[PDB]
Amino acid sequence: KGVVAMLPVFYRTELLPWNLQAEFSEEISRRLHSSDKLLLIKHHASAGVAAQFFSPTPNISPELATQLLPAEFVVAAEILEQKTTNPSISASVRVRVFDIRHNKVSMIYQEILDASQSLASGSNDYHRYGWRSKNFDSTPMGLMHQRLFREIVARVEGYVCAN
């Protein structure tokens, strides 16, 4: 199994009763944990150590990655946007994976993944049916999120295991 560290999800910016970054961090973390392809470590990386992996052009010395050891790979997912507009709700995430083996830091995967769902597909009462509630996964946002989280982890698994 590839040994991975997940950074808190990055989101640069509210009518939602929960924090989108917190949902995305937990839901991706739960799926990397459940993956039998990936061993998800617990780390305590500082704000600045995590943040460097989200710089558009990263510059990360080996010294600046040691807080993520003993992971071999660092998963850095950024929410670029979640928006509405057959009006729909959509979200876009930039996924990066870095290889931090061998006292080096290299970005081995970068891709923008996205998902969209018709707002008519279910209820948009995100206070009655918000994240964690039973029926969130039946709302347009929850359906969209579920597919996106599944794709994010499938891609991470593929690129980690390829390497």
Whose Cβ is closer to Na ion: residue 126's or residue 159's?
Answer: 159
Whose Cβ is closer to Na ion: residue 140's or residue 157's?
Answer: 157
Please, what is the minimum distance in Å from the beta carbon of residue 109 to Na ion?
Answer: 18
Q: Decide if residue 71 touches Na ion (CB under 5 A).
A: no
- 5, 6, 38, 60: which one contacts Na ion (CB under 5 A)? 38
The residue range among 33-41, 64-72, 97-105, 117-125 that interacts with Na ion, by the rule CB under 5 A, is 33-41
Whose CA is closest to 59, among 48, 67, 68, 45? Answer: 48
- 35, 52, 117, 139: which one contacts Na ion (CB under 5 A)? 35
The residue range among 34-42, 66-74, 95-103, 105-113 that interacts with Na ion, by the rule CB under 5 A, is 34-42
> Which conformational region is residue 132 in: left (phi greater than 0), alpha (psi within -120 to 50 degrees), or beta?
left
- Dihedral (Cα; 61, 63, 64, 67), 10-degree rounding: 140
Phi, psi of 117 (to 5 degrees): -150, 135
| Integer Cα distance of 126 and 118 in angstroms | 15
Please, what is the minimum distance in Å from the beta carbon of residue 37 to Na ion?
Answer: 7
* Sites of contact with Na ion (CB under 5 A): 33, 35, 38
